Design a protein around this ligand. Structure first.
Ligand SMILES: Nc1nc2c(ncn2[C@@H]2O[C@H](COP(=O)(O)OP(=O)(O)OP(=O)(O)O)[C@@H](O)[C@H]2O)c(=O)[nH]1
Ligand SMILES: Nc1nc2c(ncn2[C@@H]2O[C@H](COP(=O)(O)OP(=O)(O)O)[C@@H](O)[C@H]2O)c(=O)[nH]1
Ligand SMILES: COc1ccc(/N=N/c2cc(OC)c(OC)c(OC)c2)cc1O
Ligand SMILES: [Ca+2]
Ligand SMILES: [Mg+2]
Lengths: 426, 437, 155
């Protein structure tokens, strides 16, 4: 278990994917030309997990860039680390998806899927011990959502024994008041429940709420929201990228965090919260379990934690963390299921992220995540009851039954979270 | 003499094996390159230490040991460390992908890719033996390789070595230094499938060792290095009777005769004393009576349980160092009349005693102080059922909701195997109750 | 039958064609199979100019389709602020109720159209109107944790 193949699809996918490469290259001491200018051997130990070594001491990301709108490839290239990506790995179409899930999944997206799969095969064959795949995408658009899920299903058929992990951006009318987004999100969640092993739920509603109420930014932009997304992605991939006591990988995360196959949607959290441009151990433990620090707009005190993985970054006592973590579990005992003993794992890492001397990232599998799914479901039901813009989907080959099946599957998922929320040991 | 082959499986088995073989080298006077200046017979011999070490024509003394893991990280540390020249390189076997803390991957899917290579390499060591008595198998209960691969290996060794004894050193999980939430499942599954194939198993509770390091050695946050050093000192005291001259537990068969009255209740409790911090280099030397009394204090046990709530079926006392047999007889006499030590009515109420007059060895870099006399008590008590009950309860809490079961069923395992394994543990708890818990 | 062509012209946003068809006697209050009128279709697809021209040629501002939807319900749902104001100026019933118990306020609140929510409140939308499940627009704000929406409704 070593190599991860990163795929980024659509506008949101490529935008957050580029920020991820910028934030992790700086942490490993890799400059935009692929040269290592760091000062610690701990940066190069598991560098092969995300980077392919090339001649002349070069490190190229094992990243595949996909989109149907060609303007996205230009915006990525003009970025600071835009030239580091392998030019052969850019696979872009001529006509976009126009925020239509059916165009991404059945017509425009289906004509480019074989070309992307040839590039995926090229990177997977050059892997000594492939762990699996990591995809960044939004669920409210057309390409990341429709073509992103089709890609997941096809990659699943050729590699059924590897882990499929996604960083899925959930829509909110506070950031994009485009009314077809609940349809594209519901049709995608139906696919994600069936075909992924682990999904990090990154909600634009929570990101906007943090920026506007906590960071006091009156008109948040995508750069401000993406500042929080890149900090979360760096935090949740820390133990895949640095040695640490555990030999963490994507399969050990799934076996220990996912008790039921469909309940694989995680609520990430981060502490401290900071704005771009501009803490003791008990404050970081307290802030990690606070609703204001969650990247999904759900109150964890409305549900119960099935499993939790916490990663602390920086110089601190390992005994103080053990005491403080047990302390949070005692005062908040009613918010953890009593039928999964030792359901909280903690890890420490020496190297903190940029600017912050201390850091704490939270990964929770909580029943409160049903609040996020209930919000999308209510928006979907309001639109679908009136059959608004349904012809835009049925005209691209889709049938009405696919909408009712997706709605039924998502409501069944909410009922499944509620079932384990009310479960007792006795 | 009769040979013994040690097999170290998974991270816990390999790391404890490295600490054990380092201590064995210092006790026998073997250098890291394998040279033994005290051994006059170059190229072979019938000595006590030859049970654990073979000899080459060039005077090299090689452990009769195999290290196996499904991923290379841990065994690579052995291949590049201080004792990298001591082991046969072909007896350090590694795969590429581990069992992901999953018994089913260790036993059925990943473990199947390397089982035949491991048995062929074990056969190469067995061919070099004139009278192999059996195997010592080191592994965790909680790991995917330690649980799954060990049960597959024990199943195969029972077919290919029908009349040879098999002994285990098993690591029982603790919440303080655990790796996975599924460790209770892995522990119950490996206990079920290995029960028929193992003759005697010494469980090492990571919580018992963690507490001893904190209280006696004043280590604030013990790590695996600290735990493994103390564990290797206890394992050495148990295996000393196989590597040196003596009159008690002189072969693997005798461990079964003295500690196992019935095949299923084959889990002896080990107690060890004294454990003194190395920062107290001028500590008062404790008497035979003080160290013998310490064997009946639950705080010095290898498994957390209360022998006062149980009955004894067997009790062996293994001393090392400046111990006069008369002082042992007098200390035991006090233990019989004063204390509430109850034996079963069908066993002779008695203590078997073995004395090795060489003091215990301390490793450079360790946390233990040198002592003039030490004792390891091995007893078969019904109180060890408390350890099985604690583990069965954690299994029941998850299994009632079928939590994590899909990960096992997806890796070539039938759901029925969980209920079959659990009923076998229910019958084991009743076996201790029938004797007298 | 020009009523069938006027329905397509209002949905497509073909302003000139709508003016020609009305001049040739097309039924401004024609309905499709589901009871939708050209005004419902122009308000759903955001064609403000067609909405204004239909209202000056006898369109029933309060027409309902087979599910009780008025043009204001659909404009509030899709988020067309300018169309919402024009419909209210021409007498759209702000508290009209569809077959699911929803009012335009319930639909603007569910979809997060906060500016439309303010407009509806200023034109007398009923904060106590309950849907078929008993929920008011304020219950929707508290149930889904929308603090911005809850503040507007508490004014
Ligand atoms: N005492 C002790 N316990 C250890 C050590 N390493 C791991 N453990 C324990 O062993 C269990 C985990 O099993 P491991 O041996 O690490 O796993 P493995 O056999 O390598 O199996 P996989 O990694 O799942 O393929 C936990 O209960 C750990 O606390 C060690 O060196 N000493
Ligand atoms: N957080 C975040 N959300 C984004 C970004 N770009 C687009 N989105 C969201 O993504 C959704 C639209 O999908 P988009 O990625 O633009 O379309 P696609 O190219 O068809 O996949 C909406 O919910 C947007 O708010 C971005 O950079 N960051
Ligand atoms: C409660 O049971 C457990 C749950 C999760 C477990 N560990 N999972 C990880 C995996 C990681 O990276 C993939 C981490 O890096 C982000 C990571 O950081 C803490 C933990 C292990 C468990 O025994
Ligand atoms: Ca010799
Ligand atoms: Mg391992």
């Amino acid at each position: 278990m070593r190599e991860i193949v990163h795929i980024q699809a659509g506008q949101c996918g490529n935008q957050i994917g580029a920020k991820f490469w910028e934030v992790i290259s700086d942490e490993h001491g890799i400059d935009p030309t692929g040269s290592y200018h760091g000062d610690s051997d701990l940066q190069l130990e598991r560098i092969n997990v995300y980077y392919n070594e090339a001649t002349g001491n070069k490190y190229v990301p094992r990243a595949i860039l996909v989109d149907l709108e060609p303007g996205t490839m230009d915006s990525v290239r003009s970025g600071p680390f835009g030239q580091i990506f392998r030019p052969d790995n850019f696979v872009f179409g001529q006509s976009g998806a126009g925020n239509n899930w059916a165009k991404g999944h059945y017509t425009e997206g289906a004509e480019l899927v074989d070309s992307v799969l040839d590039v995926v095969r090229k990177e997977s064959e050059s892997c000594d011990c492939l762990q699996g795949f990591q995809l960044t995408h939004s669920l409210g658009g057309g390409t990341g959502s429709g073509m992103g899920t089709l890609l997941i299903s096809k990659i699943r058929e050729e590699y059924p024994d590897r882990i499929m992990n996604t960083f899925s951006v959930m829509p909110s009318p506070k950031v994009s008041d485009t009314v077809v987004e609940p349809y594209n999100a519901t049709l995608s969640v139906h696919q994600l429940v069936e075909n992924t092993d682990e999904t990090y739920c990154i909600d634009n509603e929570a990101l906007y709420d943090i920026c506007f109420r906590t960071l006091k930014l009156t008109t948040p932009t995508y750069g401000d929201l993406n500042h929080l997304v890149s900090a979360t992605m760096s935090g949740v991939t820390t133990c895949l990228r640095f040695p640490g006591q555990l030999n963490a990988d994507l399969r050990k995360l799934a076996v220990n965090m996912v008790p039921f196959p469909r309940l694989h949607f995680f609520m990430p959290g981060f502490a401290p919260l900071t704005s771009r441009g501009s803490l003791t151990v008990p404050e970081l433990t307290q802030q990690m379990f606070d609703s204001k620090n969650m990247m999904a707009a759900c109150d964890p005190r409305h549900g119960r934690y099935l499993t939790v993985a916490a990663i602390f970054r920086g110089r601190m006592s390992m005994k103080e963390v053990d005491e403080q973590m047990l302390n949070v579990q005692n005062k908040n005992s009613s918010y953890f299921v009593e039928w999964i003993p030792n359901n909280v794992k903690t890890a420490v890492c020496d190297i903190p992220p940029r600017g912050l001397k201390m850091s704490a990232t939270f990964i929770g599998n909580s029943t409160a995540i049903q609040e996020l799914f209930k919000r999308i479901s209510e928006q979907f039901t309001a639109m679908f009851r009136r059959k608004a813009f349904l012809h835009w989907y049925t005209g691209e080959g889709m049938d009405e039954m696919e909408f009712t099946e997706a709605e039924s599957n998502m409501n069944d998922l909410v009922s499944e979270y509620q079932q384990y929320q009310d479960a007792t040991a006795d | 003499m009769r040979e013994c082959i040690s097999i170290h499986v998974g991270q816990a088995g390999v790391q404890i094996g490295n600490a054990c073989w380092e201590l064995y080298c210092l006790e026998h006077g073997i250098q890291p390159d394998g040279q033994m200046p005290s051994d006059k017979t170059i190229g072979g011999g019938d000595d006590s230490f030859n049970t654990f070490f073979s000899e080459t024509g060039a005077g090299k003394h090689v452990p009769r040991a195999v290290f196996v893991d499904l991923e290379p990280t841990v065994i690579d540390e052995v291949r590049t460390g201080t004792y990298r020249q001591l082991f046969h390189p072909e007896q350090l076997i590694t795969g590429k992908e581990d069992a992901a803390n999953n018994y089913a991957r260790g036993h059925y899917t990943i473990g199947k890719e390397i089982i035949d290579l491991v048995l062929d390499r074990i056969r190469k060591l067995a061919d070099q033996c004139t009278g192999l008595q059996g195997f010592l198998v080191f592994h965790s209960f909680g790991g995917g390789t330690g649980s799954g691969f060990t049960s597959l290996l024990m199943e195969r060794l029972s077919v290919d070595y029908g009349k040879k004894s098999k002994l285990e050193f098993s690591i029982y999980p603790a919440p303080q230094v655990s790796t996975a939430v599924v460790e209770p499942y892995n522990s119950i599954l490996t206990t079920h499938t290995t029960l028929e194939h193992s003759d005697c198993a010494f469980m090492v509770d990571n919580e018992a060792i963690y507490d001893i390091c904190r209280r006696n050695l004043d280590i604030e946050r013990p790590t695996y290095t600290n735990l493994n050093r103390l564990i290797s000192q206890i394992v050495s005291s148990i295996t000393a009777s196989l590597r040196f001259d003596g009159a008690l537990n002189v072969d693997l068969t005798e461990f079964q005769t003295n500690l196992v009255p019935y095949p299923r209740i084959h889990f002896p409790l080990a107690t060890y004393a004294p454990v003194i911090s190395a920062e107290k280099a001028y500590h008062e030397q404790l008497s035979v009576a003080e160290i013998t009394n310490a064997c009946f204090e639950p705080a010095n046990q290898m498994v957390k349980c209360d022998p006062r709530h149980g009955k004894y079926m067997a009790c062996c006392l293994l001393y090392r160092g400046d111990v006069v047999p008369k002082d042992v007889n007098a200390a035991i006499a006090t233990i019989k009349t004063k204390r509430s030590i109850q034996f079963v009515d069908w066993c002779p109420t008695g203590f078997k005693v073995g004395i090795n007059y060489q003091p215990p060895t301390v490793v450079p870099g360790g946390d233990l102080a040198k002592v003039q006399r030490a004792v390891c008590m091995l007893s078969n008590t019904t109180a060890i059922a408390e350890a099985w009950a604690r583990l069965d309860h954690k299994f029941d809490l998850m299994y009632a909701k079928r939590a994590f079961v899909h990960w096992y069923v997806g890796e070539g395992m039938e759901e029925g195997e969980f209920s079959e394994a659990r009923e076998d543990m229910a019958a084991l708890e009743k076996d201790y109750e029938e004797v007298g818990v | 039958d020009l009523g069938k062509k006027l329905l397509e012209a209002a949905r497509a946003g073909q302003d000139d064609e709508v003016r020609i068809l009305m001049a040739n006697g097309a039924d401004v209050n024609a309905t499709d199979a589901s009871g939708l009128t050209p005004l419902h279709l122009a308000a759903t697809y955001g064609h403000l100019e067609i909405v204004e021209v239909l209202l000056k040629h006898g369109a029933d501002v309060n027409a309902i389709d087979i599910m009780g939807s008025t043009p204001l319900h659909l404009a509030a749902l899709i988020g067309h602020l300018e169309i919402v104001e024009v419909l209210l100026k021409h007498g759209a019933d702000v508290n009209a109720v569809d077959t699911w118990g929803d009012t335009p306020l319930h639909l603007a609140a569910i979809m997060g159209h906060l500016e439309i929510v303010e407009v509806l409140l200023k034109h007398g939308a009923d904060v106590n109107a309950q849907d078929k499940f008993g929920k008011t627009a304020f219950d929707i704000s508290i149930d889904n944790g929308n603090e911005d929406l809850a503040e507007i409704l508490q004014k």
